[PDB]
Design a protein around this ligand. Structure first.
Ligand SMILES: Cc1cn([C@H]2C[C@H](O)[C@@H](COP(=O)(O)OP(=O)(O)O[C@H]3O[C@H](C)C(=O)[C@H](O)[C@H]3O)O2)c(=O)[nH]c1=O
Lengths: 369, 369
């Protein structure tokens, strides 16, 4: 009854979409271009490549690792949605798991330094819940590790839950890495389905824009077949309906985010000093998006059960990916993750919470379990 | 001014789409299932798996060849959209080109017979413009070539332009092969973006539905994390907005298809016996969809130029895929394709043609070039 997630849809969407459908342009249209421009202006990076989902975005980005370009590994975290990691396999690269930092629920950057190898083609970091990874440390770790390597591996930030997040005052997508956002249904900015990739320079921008549509320069004369495909690609475009939904929702999203953060600040204050309730780390040099609010709790089943009876939806959200049969071969001991897997839990913190809803959650947690 | 392709959107779509938008259910909802059933009911095969585009349908289907499953090649035609063939490469398989039959613009089935090898994991045929491949022959040829092989290669039909097409009295999707359809913007039945895969049996249907959503059993409890992934998958689902549009347009597509065929029969009669204009083969035992109308013409550049001056859009549609740099290694001599590549051309034949528009095309072609 108090949901963990909710679709945020502008009341303007039904009208905007109706116009797009009657327009005669559903793909490769101007609405998607306009959306991309608007996103780019927000992030502070004009290099935005929209796609039909976040998983596609990662798939597209990782194709840079596999095919730069015209034995390889990707270092990644198992604590995330499978969509973060199966694109690694689809690109024909091996998964090597990096442990999780129990204080942030993000990648352990010291285990990373240990596991970076000449075989490392790419590194994927997930900003879990929109809590930014220490990108300065990440850059330092990658630089120290790959000093002689003759090519630096690709750093990919999975920003799927991280719309609105800032690091050192600037939005994610501006720190020199390839960043993938998701704009799926319950992401705070939604296009229905969709995502976009933000690139750090024009080469990556051009290359990913090409591979988004089969490697075909769309400015070419394909009416006579006078074009060449030098690098094969995928079919990952976002269509005019998505762009329309996105532009509408961009107008409302800053206010939703403000409510997420306000609700989170309320929890950090009120849930502090509760025995059996450990909160997630907080740094001064970043502003989390708080897509959901994380806690690490003793006796989690009793915790969730107690909150569920009080009408509060609660979830583990995802299984550690390293436990799936399909990646049995990459299975390795990750003690940090072991220490949080059975304790981590997510509670509603989003824009749909009223003042009383928020108190009810805190009061319910205070009633013990 | 007389366009070659046009978006077909029922005027009723806004209402249906609006319902989806007000539901809070944008992905994984019942509308897509309702659509899949309706398609299945028409095709006469219930094993329909919707996907977010036709290329993704092919990507997913070919994964059966690559990963059966829990060195390979694909025999395919180069006369087609690149979305047909790049999924071969995304699945990590080799492309081997089969020549084209210059009368049908489809695969030379005798050339196919010669190139089938123990290395063939799959065979891809395209029903170019919705003119059906002789599937009976394809089956006999595959069956004869692979007699001892201990596993029959996967047979995949690209039906992207073939909605409504019929072969030997039955719709495509009923002849025992895996069939992939597109419902992209200018295909005659559109979902905005989208496609679907039709399977010949329940094992393949279950498997593709699985890989459609990351290899996650959707009947499983993912809120407490009690699920396993045995076969990693992709993120290819069609969303509720696509399903809604598809349901609307299903109500109108039969009349649109009837107009395509009526215009094609008109051309067949009226364009016969024009010097420099060779038409495509027509068999009695199939009913083509005529997404566009094919001609093979002397001096194609002067031809297209002449019709452009009369306000008639005209196109080669796609480059022979075998000429692309990205696949330089698979380049092989294809004399049949050589014989038509510079002569093939497409002229408007769709449902938007007025009786006067249709006369104008015929009249223009007869004025010479
Ligand atoms: C996507 C789209 C196209 N059109 C018009 C515009 C063109 O005059 C004509 C073809 O459009 P486009 O530039 O997209 O053509 P191609 O790039 O060769 O590709 C199209 O035909 C090949 C075979 C594929 O397989 C593509 O999926 C399909 O997009 O139909 C519209 O009016 N609205 C639209 O949304």
């Amino acid at each position: 009854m108090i949901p963990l997630s909710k679709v945020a849809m502008s009341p303007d969407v039904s009208t905007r979409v109706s116009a797009v459908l009657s327009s005669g342009r559903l793909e490769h249209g101007p609405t998607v271009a306009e959306y991309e421009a608007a996103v780019g202006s927000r992030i502070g990076n004009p290099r935005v490549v929209s796609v039909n989902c976040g998983t596609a975005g990662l798939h597209l980005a990782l194709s840079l690792a596999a095919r730069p370009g015209a034995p390889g590994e990707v270092l990644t975290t198992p604590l995330t949605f499978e969509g973060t990691n199966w694109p690694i396999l689809a690109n024909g690269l091996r998964i090597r798991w990096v442990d999780v930092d129990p204080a942030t629920l993000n990648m352990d950057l010291d285990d990373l330094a240990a596991k970076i190898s000449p075989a490392t083609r790419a590194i994927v970091v997930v900003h879990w819940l929109g809590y930014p990874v220490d990108l300065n440390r990440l850059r330092a770790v990658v630089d120290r590790a790959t000093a002689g390597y003759d090519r630096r591996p690709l750093v990919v930030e999975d920003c799927a839950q991280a719309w609105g997040a800032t690091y050192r005052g600037a939005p994610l997508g501006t720190h020199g890495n390839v960043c993938v956002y998701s704009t799926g249904a319950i992401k705070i900015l939604t296009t229905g389905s969709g995502g976009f990739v933000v690139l750090p320079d024009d080469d990556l921008y051009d290359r990913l824009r090409l591979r988004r549509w089969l490697g075909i320069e769309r400015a070419s004369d394909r009416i006579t077949g006078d074009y060449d495909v030098a690098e094969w690609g995928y079919r990952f475009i976002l269509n005019e309906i998505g762009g329309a939904i996105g532009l509408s929702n961009l107008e409302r999203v800053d206010e939703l985010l403000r409510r997420h953060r306000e609700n989170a600040a309320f929890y950090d204050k009120e849930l502090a000093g509760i025995d059996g309730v450990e909160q997630t780390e907080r740094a001064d040099d970043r502003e989390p998006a708080f897509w959901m609010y994380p806690l690490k709790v003793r006796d989690r089943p009793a915790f969730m059960r107690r909150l569920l009876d009080a009408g509060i939806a609660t979830s583990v959200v995802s299984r550690r990916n390293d436990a799936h049969s399909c990646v049995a071969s990459a299975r390795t001991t990750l003690p940090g993750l072991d220490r949080v897997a059975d304790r981590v839990v997510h509670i509603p913190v989003g824009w749909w919470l009223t003042e009383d809803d928020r108190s009810h959650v805190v009061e319910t947690i205070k009633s013990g379990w």
